[PDB]
Design an enzyme around this catalytic site. Structure first.
Site, short mmCIF file in Angstrom:
data_model
loop_
_atom_site.label_atom_id
_atom_site.label_comp_id
_atom_site.label_asym_id
_atom_site.label_seq_id
_atom_site.Cartn_x
_atom_site.Cartn_y
_atom_site.Cartn_z
N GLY A 1 17.18 25.30 -22.99
CA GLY A 1 17.29 26.62 -23.57
C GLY A 1 18.05 27.65 -22.76
N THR A 2 18.22 28.82 -23.36
CA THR A 2 18.87 29.97 -22.75
C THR A 2 18.03 30.54 -21.60
OG1 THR A 2 20.35 30.79 -24.49
CG2 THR A 2 19.17 32.43 -23.21
N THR A 3 18.70 30.96 -20.53
CA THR A 3 18.02 31.47 -19.34
C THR A 3 17.39 32.86 -19.55
OG1 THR A 3 18.41 32.27 -17.05
CG2 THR A 3 20.37 31.91 -18.43
#
Lengths: 111, 242, 233, 198, 243, 244, 244, 241, 249
Positions: free
Chosen positions: F30-32
């Site tokens: 996923g996105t940070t």
């Protein structure tokens, strides 16, 4: 003991002509001997060229008009935008009212 | 094993597709719509000569203005017809009018997805999809004479003409060529017979084939065995020419 | 590979994927194409309809939700019915209980939370349909893209279905041209029809085949069919 | 209330039941058969509250007719009466109890003996030589106490009923429009069609 | 020929593999714990390992205050540890409401042990991968140590140890009680008992400790409490002057 | 024979629950997203991958509010995060109804803790595909928390999860070392912006949108609020000036 | 979920048999043998205990012959535990019938009920069948002396003489050789011992491994009597036939 | 409770559990039914794997549902009881609410519906039973014969058989039974029934049972000797030729 | 959400019930426990197998009182036994004492325990209990009795028996030594001799748990006043009482 009903006064009147029909009603709303409002509309346009009024206990009357308006909306959804014929509305309102046969809407209703 | 309502890597429901294969093994059904009325026809397909052919009821009435033809596991259609009939009469009780041929179908198809093995959303209790397709034909004031095909998936397509069952792809090829917008009801009567005669395993007659139609005026009517035989006789003589 | 992991929804893969959700997304990709777009004054839905025969009907892809809102489908038609009919109830609840037209952004959040539940519990399958929702509320025009995974995204324009990549490429290029079609319905539909042709490839779009929906400032959600779309061809 | 009478003789049970159904100020019917045949050799007469009366009878009729088919056999009057009692005794503490009084008149083919059971709405069952429900009993019991013998023929039994019906036609305020009379013997159940002007 | 190791059913040898693998899970946190009884107190010692410099050390804890009187230390993954904590806290409060006196240590152990037995026997419930050491100064039985495992087993102890190096602590503690010929730590103050517990922990692990490496809970008459880093530091200064 | 990774609540011979570990794989995918605790509050920030020029700016908001004082941000499967916040909101409303006080942060943490943990106990449910960073201000100071798919959570000085968790965790560690007394809320906003921009190196193929929210006792009165306008632009300007 | 571990007890083999039923019958074939024989003036029940020790008590033990009623008794072949569950529901059904009709339950009615309960576990529920077969001996004023058998498949039939459990094939041949309609109870007792004696898996037939029951009509009373034979009574009836 | 879908579709469009249910019907003893002009005759076979039974108390293969309609079956005996009971109840329920006994068509349609229900409900397997339902509608003198199967399908037959070697006896009925003229006599209708059974059964003193249903609730079961007279005559018909 | 509504114990083609067979294997590994019936009592004994030298085995009761006249001991899985003791104690009240106002006779309580073990043999989503029980008791109309209860739910009455680890060798030791004229004091003597063969480690009052079902104990009742209440027939022997008997061994 708590009494769930009241009388909000008012009077409604309907007359049909050859190609028209009128539905009238005084704009007055009362409780006991006090006036609540001199202008509180009681006859509503429900769409599909239908007008309706539910006179008696305004709380039961507003619930019913709200429930019939919503019935018209779903009749359009469920039956491909077909118009609700006035004869079909009457029958539909009968079922709305009889649903509360053992705890009734205290309204005399005209369309 | 593996779940009932499951998706294939191709993006389809296993159980629904397998059910579609069961309908192909069913007896032929053919609908045609005209501007004089929709017509239905089925193949009785008696598995033994001792079978009293008229007990094979594959054409049913839903309401005076709505008829129904089946194909596949016919036993499954009993509750489908039950719910079609009820809905039609309930609509009448509730609105003092006839249910729309369209809205009637949509309601049947709502049942079609009601299978599963677990709970998320609104609760539906049924173990497998139906193993039967339906042709639904009738008339209403709004959209005239209409013919629908209702698959166990939950979808329904309106058809000018449709065949379901065993020889349906052969029948659909013939119906494509033979249908036009200005067919008379009698021309659609012979058509059902011709296309049935072709795709049936047996030599078509008044016993292994049944006819039905629906007019605005006379409602939905199943043709008696003496009347059907006259049309087959009429057909054979018209084939004799050209 | 997936074998053993595509099982059913409540199973993760070693890589971290949900294959049942992915297989659901595949059913969209093989559904007929449909495009969405908006300016500040109007929002436009354009769906290409798919028949089964020339003797069949071009099955409808656009469903009305409330007077100000509605959506287009691609994939399983039964599933779109379940989801739209859920959105109708939530639209109605907001009208009745609060006298408030339900916000388009909040509508997306409810469909997201509905889809999510079908991806975490045993027995249930994911929804097999992707949705484009247009609406005009208290914050202007809106267009949303729904994915059966639960992923919802607001966009200026977008496309889903078969061959939808042409329409999405064209719209990305046309961004500054359409977003400024304010106070002109036809010229947003015109931009919509030119978007849907980038995904045609196979056939010519016809009068009983095109679907158009519009909503905006002074315009309630309305669908056009038959001879009523003849001008946009 | 309506008249429900019963008398057990040497070889039969006779049931006499009023023909009138009255609601308010009107007599609606004068040919009402207030009885059900539970089996070939068991009959039940019933009186009480307007709706409950027949509903219960037909519910019992169906249950005994279901037993008959299941076992290819006819239950004894004793068995049938014990079933009916239990059914009433259940409902008596329910939301809306049955308000029906019954007489069971059967002939035990196994014992070759007539049997008469009186059961009231509460589920009080009792076997009797002669029985009556309602206000009828207030006249008939003492009359039969006097004129009853346990060895009488069926013909004598009908004479003894006629003496009750005449008494009730003389001293009761209601016009109950005569009686329908039925015999339960070894040959089953039959109706005495000419009781009116006998 | 496969699935008898996935759920809690018997294997041909009469074994429950899911329960066995749950014991394996208790050693995942790589932490040792011990408990000892004094003259009128009970001490739990547990290792505290904070590998991340981004963590708030004051929240990293495997000791729980179950009630005013009961304290519990847990070996095993934290989500399971906090699952058992909340349940025990609820169970203790409910006991008081229904029976009008505080739940004794050995009863809460039994109740938790009984609950584990259930996941052992029912298929839809997995066992918890934890070993629970309950300590208190019970009003009837004095200083008390009771311990439960994923099998649903439980028993009282004179002293106990749990963790990867459990065996080294146990034989170390046994050897002290043979020489002393009694089953407790003969000291009035709990301070020296805590000092004893650390001393005999280092000796059996061969690793020195600072204030952030340990975690200490103490149970006395009418109270159970956990020491601050500063109270442990104070205690560490005392043992250093001893040697 | 094996197959200890096919069903949720199953232990493998080494004591692990493999399905939970697979859930982490969706999180790492996923996105940070990050969290910084300061001397009087908490700051939250998330990467937002701009896949198309057709994504309306400032609109697809990922940071969620619980009650009026708690903010939550998560990495991984977005819909799972929402479901978890919906539970959180119910859990908070339940607390602020029995007890008058708005829910304490340690309290709220455990409530999510027990709920996520519950989804590792049965084979009929799936674990969550999200690591969640949440926190706020309560009766005694500020608190920051991070919660794994296993139901594991701890208190944090700084927290980070997602595609760029490496870069972020390193950056945060320099802040803990260099600022022992404490960072201020105003500074932590600017700083968070730099951490997201530096953690973008991993996902640097597509352009992104920065999103910051904060909860500070003396800057927002203890209520969770988003960062907009002047302060949002100033933070991007600070991040862009230290990326060169 | 649980799909993976489901035996699916109540399904058909491609052949048309019911797996679990068939395997439950195979279970019973290994249980101790039970025998029922109907005479003109009564019925006899006899059972073989199977493996027994010297230290086993036989005084309190009645593990294979159970009284259902004043007028009906049963012989059990299979799992004792499973059997007691079924005996107890049947004891109840008899009392229900007596409460309702004030008459003792006819034998077939009680038998049909028990066979329907057994049939239940064969068509629905997902549970294993009862590993039990019954021999019913009873009297009613409709058919007089009746002898029935019921197995896990929910099927029942009526017999003049019958065996269940181990070596029924061998036992059935020996009864079919020596049974005649005009038998007296004392002759039937003799037959029962003679059959068991040849189909035992033991060295000799002893009293302590046997259980006996008769259902007679009192040759003076004029009414039905049940007798469960006491240890000493079997010991005596064994010397008469010359087995000692 | 337990709601596992046991009846499910397979790749080629078959419900294997329904299919396997028919395999149990094939295993079950043979059953036949022929309808005359004024009667319906039902015939069944008795097995002889073990012969030391009591025939009085053992349930005879033809069951009465109401006083005018009968039901015979081929398949699992324990399943059939559940079907019979349910049909017997519905029979009473119909008299209660419609005030008229069931038609044969209706009573068949109900049984068929019960069976069909068990093929798409969770946690249940289909019935391993096919039925022959026969009788007369109230106030009607026209014979009715119907057949149901585990799939839930039903139809009416001039003549039909079910069970083991039903293939061979259906073969017999297909060449022998005339549609132009059925058996006019009650006597000659029974003859055709025994003849068709003697193909599969073997010379059976028992082994064959016959039940004859006429209009107005006239149902009677034939004795050993009455059947035996037909058996003695039929085998003497061949020897003359 | 429990979806396990099907049986986990089912029939194999050979007719074995797998799970019950496996439950019996678990009992086989369990520590040896025994039962002996005398003319004037019953005795039940087992070994307190220490799990650690630090553990307090007094806190672990392998023997339990069910009713004041009925006791129980086991072999196999301790956890399973413990919950069974709890259920059995309760069922003795709810199914008997609360209806009839007296404690259930030994055969009926055994019957009820068996019933609970049967259900785990058939109910959805459960495994059988991995224990065998030995139940000794006394009731007015039956005298002294002893029953064995198995994972299947079967129970048999015994004059004397042993279960578990060294049952085979113990059963053989009992047959040699049991007669129908044994006094209670003698039955205890034999019990200790039999158990000494199973124990390799320490054999004393602390490593052996032993209870009896004998005469009525008035001093253990707790109160005086009711003549028809004479106290429990169950008594656990103290560590001291066992050692006294071991000195004359």
């Amino acid at each position: 003991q708590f009494n769930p009903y009241g009388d909000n006064g008012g009077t409604i009147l309907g007359i049909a002509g050859e190609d028209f029909a009128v539905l009238a009603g005084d704009t007055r709303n009362i409780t006991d001997y006090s006036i609540n409002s001199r202008y509180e509309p009681k006859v509503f346009d429900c769409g599909d060229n239908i007008v309706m009024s539910a006179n008696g206990f305004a709380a039961d009357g507003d619930a019913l008009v709200k429930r019939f308006k919503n019935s018209v909306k779903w009749y359009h959804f469920d039956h491909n935008d077909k118009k609700l014929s006035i004869n079909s509305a009457a029958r539909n309102i009968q079922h709305l009212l009889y649903g509360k046969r053992f705890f009734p809407y205290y309204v005399h209703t005209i369309i | 094993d593996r779940g009932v309502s499951t998706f294939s890597p191709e993006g389809r429901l296993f159980q629904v597709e397998y059910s579609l294969e069961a309908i192909k093994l069913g007896s032929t059904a053919i609908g045609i719509a005209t501007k004089e009325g929709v017509v239905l026809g089925v193949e009785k397909r008696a598995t033994s000569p001792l079978l009293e052919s008229d007990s094979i009821e594959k054409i049913v009435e839903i309401d005076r203005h709505i008829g129904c033809a089946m194909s596949g596991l016919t036993a499954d259609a009993r509750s489908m017809i039950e719910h079609a009939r009820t809905a039609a009469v309930t609509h009448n009780l509730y609105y003092d009018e006839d249910i729309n041929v369209e809205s009637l179908t949509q309601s049947v198809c709502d049942l079609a997805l009601r299978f599963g093995e677990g709970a998320s959303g609104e609760e539906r209790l049924m173990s497998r999809p139906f193993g039967v397709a339906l042709l639904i034909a009738g008339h209403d004031a709004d959209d005239g004479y209409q013919l629908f095909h209702a698959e166990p998936s939950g979808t329904f397509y309106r058809y000018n003409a449709k065949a379901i069952g065993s020889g349906s792809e052969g029948a659909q090829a013939e119906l494509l060529n033979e249908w036009h917008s200005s067919l008379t009801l009698k021309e659609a009567e012979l058509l059902v017979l011709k296309i049935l005669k072709q795709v049936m395993e047996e030599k078509l007659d008044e016993n292994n084939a049944q006819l039905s139609c629906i007019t605005k005026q006379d409602g939905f009517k199943i043709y008696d065995n003496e009347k059907t035989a006259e049309l087959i006789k009429e057909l054979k003589e018209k084939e004799a020419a050209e | 590979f997936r074998n053993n992991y595509d099982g059913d929804t409540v199973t993760f893969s070693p890589t971290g994927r949900l294959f049942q959700v992915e297989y659901a997304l595949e059913a969209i990709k093989q559904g007929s194409v449909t495009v969405g777009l908006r300016s500040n004054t109007h929002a436009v839905l354009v769906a290409l309809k798919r028949n089964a025969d020339e003797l069949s009907s071009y099955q409808k892809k656009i469903i009305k939700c409330d007077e100000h809102m509605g959506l287009s489908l691609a994939g399983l038609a039964p599933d779109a019915r379940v989801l739209s009919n859920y959105l109708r109830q939530q639209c109605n609840y907001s009208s009745l209980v609060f006298n408030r037209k339900l916000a388009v952004e909040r509508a997306g959040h409810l469909l997201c939370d509905k889809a999510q539940k079908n991806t975490q519990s045993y027995g249930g399958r994911p929804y097999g349909v992707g949705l484009l929702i247009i609406g005009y509320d208290k914050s202007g025009a809106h267009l949303l893209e729904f994915q059966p995974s639960g992923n919802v995204t607001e966009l200026y324009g977008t496309a889903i279905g078969a061959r939808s990549q042409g329409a999405k490429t064209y719209l990305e290029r046309t961004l500054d041209t359409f977003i400024k079609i304010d106070g002109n319905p036809d010229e947003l539909i015109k931009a919509g029809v030119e978007a849907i042709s980038q995904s045609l490839r196979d056939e010519s779009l016809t009068v009983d085949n095109l679907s158009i929906a519009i909503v905006g400032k002074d315009t309630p959600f309305t669908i056009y069919d038959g001879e009523a779309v003849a001008k946009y061809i | 209330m309506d008249i429900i009478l019963g008398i057990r003789v040497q070889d039969s049970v006779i049931l006499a039941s009023s023909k009138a159904v009255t609601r308010g100020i009107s007599v609606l019917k004068d040919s009402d058969d207030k009885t059900r045949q539970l089996s070939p050799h068991t009959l039940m007469s019933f009186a009480g509250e307007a709706g409950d009366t027949v509903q219960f009878a037909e519910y019992i009729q169906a249950n005994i007719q279901l037993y008959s088919i299941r076992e290819d056999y006819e239950l004894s009057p004793q068995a049938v009466s014990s079933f009916v009692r239990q059914e009433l005794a259940k409902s008596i503490r329910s939301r809306r109890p049955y308000q029906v009084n019954v007489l069971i008149g059967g002939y035990d083919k196994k014992k070759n003996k007539p049997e008469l059971y009186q059961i009231d709405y509460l589920g009080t069952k009792v076997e009797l030589p002669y029985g009556a429900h309602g206000y009828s009993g207030f006249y008939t019991f003492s009359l039969l106490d006097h004129h009853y013998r346990p060895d009488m023929t069926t013909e004598e039994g009908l004479d003894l009923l006629k003496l009750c019906v005449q008494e009730l036609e003389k001293r009761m305020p209601m016009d109950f429009k005569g009686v329908i009379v039925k015999i339960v013997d070894k040959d089953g159940i039959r109706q005495v069609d000419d009781f009116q002007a006998q | 020929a496969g699935y008898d190791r996935h759920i809690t059913i018997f294997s041909p040898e009469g074994r429950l593999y899911q329960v066995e693998y749950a014991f394996k899970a208790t050693n995942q946190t790589n932490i040792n714990s011990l408990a000892v009884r004094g003259k009128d107190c009970t001490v739990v010692i547990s290792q505290k390992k904070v590998p991340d410099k981004l963590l708030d050390p004051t929240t990293v804890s495997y000791i729980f205050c179950i009630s005013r009187t009961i304290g519990m230390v847990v070996n095993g993954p934290i989500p399971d540890a906090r699952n058992a904590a909340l349940r025990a806290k609820a169970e203790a409060a409910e006991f008081r409401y229904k029976y009008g006196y505080d739940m004794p240590c050995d009863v809460l152990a039994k109740r938790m042990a009984n609950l584990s037995q259930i996941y052992t026997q029912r298929a839809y419930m997995r066992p918890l991968g934890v070993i629970l050491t309950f300590v208190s100064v019970d009003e009837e039985l004095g200083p008390s140590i009771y311990k439960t495992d994923p099998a649903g087993y439980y028993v009282g102890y004179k002293a106990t140890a749990t963790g990867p190096k459990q065996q080294e602590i146990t034989t170390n503690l046994e050897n002290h009680f043979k020489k002393s010929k009694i089953d407790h730590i003969n000291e009035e103050s709990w301070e020296k008992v805590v000092e004893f517990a650390i001393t005999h922990m280092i000796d059996a692990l061969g690793t020195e400790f600072s204030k952030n490496d340990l975690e200490v809970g103490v149970a006395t008459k009418d109270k159970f409490f956990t020491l601050s880093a500063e109270n442990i530091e104070e205690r560490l200064v005392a043992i250093a002057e001893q040697d | 024979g094996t197959g200890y990774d096919l069903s949720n609540s199953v232990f493998s011979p080494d004591g692990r629950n493999f399905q939970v570990e697979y859930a982490v794989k969706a999180v790492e995918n996923g996105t940070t997203s990050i969290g910084i605790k300061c001397n009087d509050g908490v700051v939250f920030a998330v990467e937002k991958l701009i896949t198309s020029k057709l994504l309306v700016p400032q609109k697809n908001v990922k940071i969620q509010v619980v009650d009026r004082h708690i903010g939550c941000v998560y990495s991984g499967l977005i819909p799972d995060g929402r479901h978890l916040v919906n539970r959180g909101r119910e859990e908070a409303a339940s607390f602020k109804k029995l007890y008058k006080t708005p829910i304490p942060i340690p309290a709220f943490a455990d409530r999510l803790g027990q709920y996520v943990q519950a989804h590792t106990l049965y084979n009929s449910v799936r674990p969550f595909g999200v690591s969640t960073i949440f926190g706020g201000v309560d009766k005694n100071g500020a608190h920051l928390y991070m919660l794994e798919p296993s139901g594991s959570y701890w208190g944090y000085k700084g927290a980070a999860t997602g595609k760029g968790r490496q870069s972020a965790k390193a950056e945060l560690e320099k802040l803990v070392d260099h600022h022992p007394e404490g960072l201020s809320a105003r500074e932590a906003v600017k700083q968070a912006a730099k951490i997201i921009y530096l953690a973008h190196e991993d996902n640097k193929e597509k352009d992104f949108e920065l999103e910051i929210s904060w909860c500070s006792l003396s800057e927002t009165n203890g209520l969770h609020k988003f960062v907009k306008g002047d302060l949002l632009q100033e933070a991007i300007d600070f991040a862009q000036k230290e990326i060169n | 979920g649980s799909r993976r571990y489901d035996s699916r007890t109540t399904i058909f083999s491609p052949e048309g048999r019911l797996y679990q039923v068939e395997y439950a019958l195979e279970s019973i074939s290994h249980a101790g043998t039970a025998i029922g024989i109907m005479a003109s003036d009564g019925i006899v029940l006899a059972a073989e205990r199977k493996v027994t020790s010297t230290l086993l008590e036989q005084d309190t033990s009645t593990e294979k012959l159970y009284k259902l009623n004043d007028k009906i008794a049963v012989a059990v072949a299979g799992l004792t535990a499973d059997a007691e569950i079924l005996i107890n529901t049947a004891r109840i059904h008899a009392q229900n019938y007596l409460k309702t009709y004030n008459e003792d339950i006819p034998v077939e009615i009680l038998v049909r009920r028990l066979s329907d309960i057994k049939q239940g576990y064969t068509q629905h529920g997902g549970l294993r069948p009862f590993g039990v077969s019954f021999i019913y001996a009873g009297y009613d004023d409709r058919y007089g002396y009746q002898l029935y058998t019921s197995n896990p498949s929910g099927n029942y039939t009526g017999w003049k003489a019958i065996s269940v459990g181990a070596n029924t094939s061998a036992a059935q041949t020996l009864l079919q050789m020596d049974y005649k309609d005009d038998m007296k109870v004392d002759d039937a007792i003799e037959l029962a011992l003679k059959t068991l004696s040849k189909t035992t898996d033991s060295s000799a037939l002893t009293y302590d491994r046997l259980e006996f029951a008769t259902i007679r009509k009192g040759a003076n009373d004029g009414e039905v009597y049940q007798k469960i034979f006491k240890p000493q009574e079997i010991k005596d009836i064994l010397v008469k036939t010359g087995i000692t | 409770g337990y709601d596992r879908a046991l009846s499910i579709f397979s790749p080629d469009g078959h419900i294997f559990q329904v299919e396997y249910a028919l395999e149990a019907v094939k295993r079950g003893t043979c059953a036949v039914g022929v309808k005359g002009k004024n009667c319906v005759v039902l015939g069944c076979e008795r097995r002889s794997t073990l012969k030391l039974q009591d025939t009085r108390i053992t349930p005879s293969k033809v069951s009465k549902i109401d006083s005018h309609v009968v039901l015979s079956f081929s398949g699992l005996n324990a399943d059939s009881r559940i079907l019979i009971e349910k049909a017997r109840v519905e029979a009473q329920s119909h008299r209660l609410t419609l005030e008229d006994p069931v038609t044969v068509e209706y009573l068949t349609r109900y049984v068929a519906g019960v069976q069909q229900r068990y093929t798409q409900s969770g946690g249940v397997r289909p019935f391993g039973v096919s039925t022959l339902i026969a009788g007369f509608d109230p106030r009607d003198d026209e014979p009715k014969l119907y057949q149901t199967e585990p799939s839930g399908i039903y139809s009416s037959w001039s003549a039909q058989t079910i069970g083991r070697n039903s293939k061979t006896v259906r073969e017999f009925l297909e060449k022998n039974y005339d549609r132009k003229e059925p058996p006019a006599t009650v006597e000659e209708c029974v003859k055709l029934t025994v003849r068709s059974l003697l193909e599969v059964v073997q010379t059976g003193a028992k082994n064959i049972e016959i039940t004859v249903v006429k209009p107005d609730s006239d149902i009677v079961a034939l004795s050993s000797e009455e059947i035996n007279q037909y058996v003695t005559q039929i085998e003497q018909e061949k020897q003359e030729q | 959400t429990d979806r396990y509504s099907f049986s986990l114990t089912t029939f194999s083609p050979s007719g074995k019930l797998g799970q019950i067979d496996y439950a019996l294997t678990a009992v086989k590994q369990g520590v040896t426990s025994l039962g002996i019936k005398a003319t004037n009592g019953v005795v039940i004994a087992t070994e307190k197998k220490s799990s650690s030298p630090l553990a307090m085995s007094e806190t672990l009761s392998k023997v339990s009182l069910l009713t004041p006249d009925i006791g129980a001991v086991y072999s196999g899985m301790g956890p399973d036994y413990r919950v069974l003791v709890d259920k059995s104690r309760k069922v003795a009240h709810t199914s008997y004492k609360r209806i009839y106002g007296e404690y259930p006779p030994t055969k009926l309580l055994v019957s009820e325990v068996a019933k609970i073990m049967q259900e785990a043999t058939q109910s959805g989503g459960v495994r059988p209990f991995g224990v065998s029980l030995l139940i000794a008791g006394h009731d007015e109309f039956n005298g002294f009795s002893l029953y064995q209860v198995d994972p299947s739910g079967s129970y048999f009455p015994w004059k004397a028996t042993a279960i578990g680890k060294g049952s085979v060798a113990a059963k053989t030791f009992l047959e040699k030594r049991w007669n129908d004229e044994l006094e209670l004091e003698d039955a205890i003597h034999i019990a200790l001799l039999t158990l000494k063969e199973s124990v390799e480690g320490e054999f004393n009052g602390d490593t052996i748990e032993l209870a009896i079902i004998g005469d009525e104990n008035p001093d253990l009742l707790g109160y005086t006043g009711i003549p028809t209440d004479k106290g429990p027939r169950f008594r656990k022997l103290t560590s001291q009482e066992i050692n006294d008997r071991l000195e004359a061994l």
